[PDB]
Amino acid sequence: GMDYAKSDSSSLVTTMGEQFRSLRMLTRRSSPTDVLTGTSVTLPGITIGTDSSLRQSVLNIISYMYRFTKGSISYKIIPKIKGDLYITTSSADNIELNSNAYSFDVNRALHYQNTALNPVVQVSLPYYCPSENLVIDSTSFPNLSNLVLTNLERSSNTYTVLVSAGDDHTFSQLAGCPAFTIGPSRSA
Amino acid sequence: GMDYAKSDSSSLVTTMGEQFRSLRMLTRRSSPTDVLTGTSVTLPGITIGTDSSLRQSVLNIISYMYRFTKGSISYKIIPKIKGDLYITTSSADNIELNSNAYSFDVNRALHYQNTALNPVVQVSLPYYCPSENLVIDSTSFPNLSNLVLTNLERSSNTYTVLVSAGDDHTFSQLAGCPAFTIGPSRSA
Amino acid sequence: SKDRDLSKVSPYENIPAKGFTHGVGFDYGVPLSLFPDNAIDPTIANPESI
Amino acid sequence: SKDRDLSKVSPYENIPAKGFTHGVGFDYGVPLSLFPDNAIDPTIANPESI
Amino acid sequence: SKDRDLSKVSPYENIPAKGFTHGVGFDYGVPLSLFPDNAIDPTIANPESI
Amino acid sequence: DDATASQRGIVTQVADTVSSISNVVDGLGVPLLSSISKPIGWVSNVVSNVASIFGF
Amino acid sequence: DDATASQRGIVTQVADTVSSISNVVDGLGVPLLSSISKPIGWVSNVVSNVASIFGF
Amino acid sequence: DDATASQRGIVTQVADTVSSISNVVDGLGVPLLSSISKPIGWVSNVVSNVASIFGF
Amino acid sequence: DDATASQRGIVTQVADTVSSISNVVDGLGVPLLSSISKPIGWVSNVVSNVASIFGF
Amino acid sequence: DDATASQRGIVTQVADTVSSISNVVDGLGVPLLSSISKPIGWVSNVVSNVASIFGF
Numbered sequence: 017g018m019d020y021a022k023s024d025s026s027s028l029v030t031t032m033g034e035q036f037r038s039l040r041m042l043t044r045r046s047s048p049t050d051v052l053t054g055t056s057v058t059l060p061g062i063t064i065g066t067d068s069s070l071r072q073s074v075l076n077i078i079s080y081m082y083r084f085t086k087g088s089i090s091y092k093i094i095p096k097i098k099g100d101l102y103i104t105t106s107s108a109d110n111i112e113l114n115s116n117a118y119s120f121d122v123n124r125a126l127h128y129q130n131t132a133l134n135p136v137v138q139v140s141l142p143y144y145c146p147s148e149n150l151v152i153d154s155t156s157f158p159n160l161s162n163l164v165l166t167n168l169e170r171s172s173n174t175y176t177v178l179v180s181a182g183d184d185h186t187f188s189q190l191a192g193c194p195a196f197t198i199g200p201s202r203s204a
Numbered sequence: 205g206m207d208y209a210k211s212d213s214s215s216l217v218t219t220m221g222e223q224f225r226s227l228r229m230l231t232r233r234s235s236p237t238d239v240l241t242g243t244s245v246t247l248p249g250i251t252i253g254t255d256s257s258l259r260q261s262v263l264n265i266i267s268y269m270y271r272f273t274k275g276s277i278s279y280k281i282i283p284k285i286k287g288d289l290y291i292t293t294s295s296a297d298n299i300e301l302n303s304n305a306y307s308f309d310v311n312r313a314l315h316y317q318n319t320a321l322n323p324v325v326q327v328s329l330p331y332y333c334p335s336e337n338l339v340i341d342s343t344s345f346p347n348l349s350n351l352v353l354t355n356l357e358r359s360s361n362t363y364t365v366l367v368s369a370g371d372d373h374t375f376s377q378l379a380g381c382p383a384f385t386i387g388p389s390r391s392a
Numbered sequence: 393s394k395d396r397d398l399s400k401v402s403p404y405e406n407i408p409a410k411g412f413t414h415g416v417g418f419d420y421g422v423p424l425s426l427f428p429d430n431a432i433d434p435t436i437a438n439p440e441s442i
Numbered sequence: 443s444k445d446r447d448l449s450k451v452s453p454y455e456n457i458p459a460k461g462f463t464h465g466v467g468f469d470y471g472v473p474l475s476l477f478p479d480n481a482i483d484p485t486i487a488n489p490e491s492i
Numbered sequence: 493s494k495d496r497d498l499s500k501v502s503p504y505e506n507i508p509a510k511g512f513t514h515g516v517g518f519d520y521g522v523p524l525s526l527f528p529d530n531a532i533d534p535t536i537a538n539p540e541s542i
Numbered sequence: 543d544d545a546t547a548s549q550r551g552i553v554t555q556v557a558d559t560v561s562s563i564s565n566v567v568d569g570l571g572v573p574l575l576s577s578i579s580k581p582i583g584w585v586s587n588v589v590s591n592v593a594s595i596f597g598f
Numbered sequence: 599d600d601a602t603a604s605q606r607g608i609v610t611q612v613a614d615t616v617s618s619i620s621n622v623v624d625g626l627g628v629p630l631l632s633s634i635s636k637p638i639g640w641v642s643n644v645v646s647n648v649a650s651i652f653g654f
Numbered sequence: 655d656d657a658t659a660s661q662r663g664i665v666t667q668v669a670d671t672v673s674s675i676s677n678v679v680d681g682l683g684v685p686l687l688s689s690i691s692k693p694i695g696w697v698s699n700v701v702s703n704v705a706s707i708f709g710f
Numbered sequence: 711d712d713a714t715a716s717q718r719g720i721v722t723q724v725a726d727t728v729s730s731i732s733n734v735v736d737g738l739g740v741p742l743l744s745s746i747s748k749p750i751g752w753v754s755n756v757v758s759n760v761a762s763i764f765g766f
Numbered sequence: 767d768d769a770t771a772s773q774r775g776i777v778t779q780v781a782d783t784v785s786s787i788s789n790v791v792d793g794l795g796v797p798l799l800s801s802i803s804k805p806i807g808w809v810s811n812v813v814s815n816v817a818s819i820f821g822f
Contacts, residue, residue: 033530040821041465112388123262125413125474133406136458138471148487186484221480228765229415313424324408326421336437371494374434398660400775401453401510415476416493417609431638435631442628448548450663451503465526467721481750485743492740498604500551517777531806535799542796559649578654593671598690615761634766705783710802727817746822
């Protein structure tokens with residue numbers, strides 16, 4: 017080999033409060049995405065990914081080095097105008113145009129919450145797929161479940177959302193890195 | 205037999221988060237019924253069933269394959285205008301027309317709650333019947349107990365109600381299925 | 393006799409009904425009856441054993 | 443039968459989500475599913491052992 | 493499966509920070525860091541043993 | 543046994559005892575008051591003179 | 599076992615039993631109602647005449 | 655015993671002791687102050703020099 | 711061990727195991743996925759056919 | 767011992783140790799820093815490579 021290397025000699029506890037040796041721990045941590053104004057709110061599905069713009073979740077950034085995903089994902093939601101709201105799942109087939117029907121009419125799993133008491137909504141979305149694996153941004157399964165939320169009376173509102181990997185979640189197959197920016201934008 | 209069948213070979217844990225092998229579990233789950241506007245509110249009794257329209261509870265849907273029921277049933281209630289309210293049972297004989305009497309005057313089991321603190325009313329209705337079994341929508345027992353709820357001052361209000369089978373509950377005798385619709389309504 | 397309490401402050405959350413869509417675990421609601429725990433056995437009056 | 447409770451008053455704090463930025467310990471959120479505890483094993487379908 | 497809860501109603505008080513002027517017992521605050529329990533040992537880098 | 547009844551924390555158990563039934567008519571009878579009696583539990587302290595009585 | 603189920607405080611366990619499956623078709627079968635039965639637990643008190651029934 | 659008294663969580667027990675009564679007149683007497691004394695419990699720490707005193 | 715992890719009530723412990731490290735380079739290595747695996751705990755119930763599955 | 771200190775729930779005890787006093791002048795002395803040291807408790811996990819480090 018012809019190494020000059022001699023192995024280190026340093027204590028772990030002396031300088032910083034923790035140490036981590038995996039990327040999963042960084043992903044379990046929850047981070048902000050983008051503000052969702054209006055009635056027809058659209059949270060990302062478990063297929064996740066493919067955001068434009070430049071602001072983006074940490075999970076969404078780690079997402080580009082891999083190819084497969086599997087497992088449930090978590091959401092925190094903070095409504096701007098306080099008051100109760102409801103959470104429900106749906107699918108493209110599951111929708112109706114009777115114009116007297118509404119989102120409760122399918123009997124999916126439901127979640128109620130008055131935000132005046134508990135401002136921070138916390139919802140975990142499970143993993144219902146036929147296949148053991150999912151290529152990221154797969155379109156091979158059109159009817160995968162997708163989240164929806166409604167106040168009754170169908171009034172407009174904004175939400176501060178922040179996603180995280182579920183404890184069940186993982187990535188697999190290591191593709192190489194995307195080009196990426198690092199510093200603050202130069203000039204104006 | 206002349207079977208080509210060869211028995212399966214597949215793991216359970218690999219693809220979805222749970223598995224269920226009974227209809228009771230689906231029925232213990234609570235689902236929305238219909239909005240109850242006005243003062244003279246009428247929740248369904250333990251005889252349950254026979255709703256018209258098309259929106260209907262999951263319990264109410266499972267109801268049509270059977271003939272007998274037995275056991276207590278549960279309710280969740282969400283008032284639109286917040287403020288305290290009362291819950292009481294009654295029966296057709298039990299009612300009075302003195303026009304100074306009111307629902308508290310019979311000394312039945314009672315339940316108070318201020319909704320400003322606890323918005324979600326939760327009440328379980330027991331099983332007082334002479335008979336071990338009940339044919340669904342039985343009319344052989346006119347005086348069965350029936351729920352009533354009142355704000356004091358007798359003001360108008362709406363309620364979001366959602367029923368569920370009690371842990372004590374079951375169905376028996378398997379009649380065959382009703383005709384039933386499946387897809388979203390075609391055309392307008 | 394009025395000795396000092398010590399203990400510990402502990403965090404909580406106000407969520408009135410944590411899981412009713414779940415198929416398992418805890419009713420929460422108050423029965424409208426004397427005796428907190430009403431019950432009956434369904435298994436006895438059934439037309440068949442299975 | 444209605445015997446007196448004794449116990450002790452105990453202090454608390456209303457903090458809805460004590461630590462989500464942490465990389466460890468407790469989800470808190472309610473899964474939108476039958477059965478409170480969904481799970482699957484990631485380790486099985488992996489392309490490689492490490 | 494949804495068996496009745498029994499338990500007991502229990503009294504509490506809403507006091508957000510019971511004792512910060514005290515010289516002993518419990519931080520309460522959330523560290524702004526991955527891992528809930530940061531630490532380091534002060535005793536090691538000291539100029540002298542006492 | 544109110545102390546244990548509150549410490550255990552469950553509504554149902556409410557301190558068990560078994561009464562001595564008498565005057566059975568048809569499988570039903572009347573309990574003696576003498577055996578329905580339940581412990582009071584401060585009296586032992588007042589008679590034994592525990593310190594807490596004096597506030598110390 | 600609702601008392602223990604509430605005292606232990608965890609949602610999942612919900613009092614274990616093992617049912618006697620029958621009429622297996624292809625590795626799946628139908629439990630007997632006789633063995634799905636679970637304890638009621640107030641009945642023992644009413645039959646044994648515990649004091650709490652009388653309020654004392 | 656305030657630590658145990660708060661940990662056990664019940665109002666009544668308040669750490670038992672039995673005082674030495676004297677000067678009985680008619681079945682009633684006066685406790686000694688010497689025996690009404692109750693443990694303080696920080697003093698042991700200050701005298702034994704526990705680490706927590708120094709904040710570490 | 712989520713049941714115990716929630717019952718014990720402390721954030722840190724999160725169910726211990728010891729992984730089998732391999733491919734050490736300089737005192738650091740890569741854990742096998744096979745040993746990072748943790749119990750799921752509902753599966754035993756579904757396979758053993760516990761009563762709670764049927765709601766009774 | 768923060769885990770036990772939080773689990774036990776009482777403010778006072780704060781994990782006991784006994785320091786080695788030195789340089790006594792008049793019944794008072796200076797503790798060694800070496801013995802005031804208290805366990806950190808995540809380090810054992812990082813060195814032993816517990817599964818929770820990897821999130822599984």
